[PDB]
Ligand binder design. Structure first.
Ligand SMILES: N#Cc1ccc(C[C@H](N)C(=O)O)cc1
Length: 307
């Protein structure tokens, strides 16, 4: 539609936009996203869930894969310890306002029929394509393990096992999604979300990096992290404060600032906040204060539920 544009909104690419339109014409449609369990669920994760919500509202049946086996394979720790992290993740996503079927990797990824197809894919996959597909995913290892090349082929097969019409991931999943489109009999539509900039300006919002706003973060933590964050005046590109404002805030918005500092600015859209920021009219402190307070209101239900 419409459904199309709502879905295309705030994504980096759709492989392929055309095939997405075709899928939308169907009465029955399915979509998945998978996540390696992570102790902290941040704004990078929420952005993607909002995308699922968008697909959910467009008629898609949503599947969330808690990929405990992939994280095991990607050296995140012990299988039982990762499933418990995955139990917590389900609860967080179950607070984010999306009705979806939740599924653990370790349930069906050890199925005889599953395992059999993984081996069939291993025969079709070159070690070079499997190694290349993992560059932006693999935990830095000085001596690459056999688990590294099993990881993409198991991810590829999940889209097949589940029978999804669409696979959703961040931009770093692009190569595994490209592999999936070459190894599977049914080509799946691949929707890619942008990579959120970390709070310190360092590329990606990451759980192990400590430069993220977690969805369960208390108001004081949100204010503190927003305060220390990279946000020089006039810069929009790679500004994490500006990115949160783009992706998470509802517009029109009003920035409650001191009367002597310029009054009170009411912002019609993100792009209005953009031109005001780029043109020194809105100081970083004022932007920070408004962003912190709005974020506190948006994640208030998530936070509230998780206790
Ligand atoms: N089916 C299926 C499936 C989809 C995604 C993943 C994890 C993914 N590589 C991630 O980084 O989030 C694992 C399994």
């Amino acid at each position: 539609m419409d459904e199309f544009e709502m879905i295309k909104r705030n994504t980096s690419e759709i492989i392929s936009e055309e095939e997405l339109r075709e899928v939308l014409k169907k009465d029955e449609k399915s979509a998945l996203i998978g996540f390696e369990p992570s102790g902290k669920i941040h704004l990078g994760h929420y952005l993607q869930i909002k995308k699922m919500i968008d697909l959910q509202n467009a008629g898609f049946d949503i599947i969330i894969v808690l990929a405990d086996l992939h994280a095991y394979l990607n050296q995140k720790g012990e299988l039982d310890e990762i499933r418990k992290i995955g139990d917590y993740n389900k609860k967080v996503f179950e607070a984010m306002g999306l009705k979806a079927k939740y599924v653990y990797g370790s349930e069906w990824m050890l199925d005889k029929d599953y395992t059999l197809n993984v081996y069939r894919l291993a025969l079709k996959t070159t070690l070079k394509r499997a190694r290349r597909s993992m560059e932006l995913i693999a935990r830095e290892d000085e001596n690459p393990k056999v688990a590294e090349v099993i990881y993409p082929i198991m991810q590829v097969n999940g889209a097949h096992y589940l029978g999804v019409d669409v696979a959703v991931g961040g931009m770093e999943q692009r190569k595994i999604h490209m592999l999936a489109r070459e190894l599977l009999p049914k080509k799946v539509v691949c929707i890619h979300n942008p990579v959120l900039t970390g709070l310190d300006g360092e590329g990606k919002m990451s759980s192990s990096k400590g430069n993220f706003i977690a969805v369960d973060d208390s108001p004081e933590e949100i204010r503190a992290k927003i305060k220390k964050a990279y946000c020089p005046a006039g810069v929009v590109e790679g500004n994490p404060i500006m990115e949160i404002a783009k992706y998470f805030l509802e517009y029109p918005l009003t920035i409650k600032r001191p009367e002597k500092f310029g009054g009170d600015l009411t912002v019609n859209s993100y792009e209005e906040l953009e031109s005001l920021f780029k043109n020194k009219e809105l100081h970083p402190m004022d932007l920070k204060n408004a962003v912190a307070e709005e974020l506190i209101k948006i994640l208030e239900p998530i936070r509230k539920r998780l206790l």
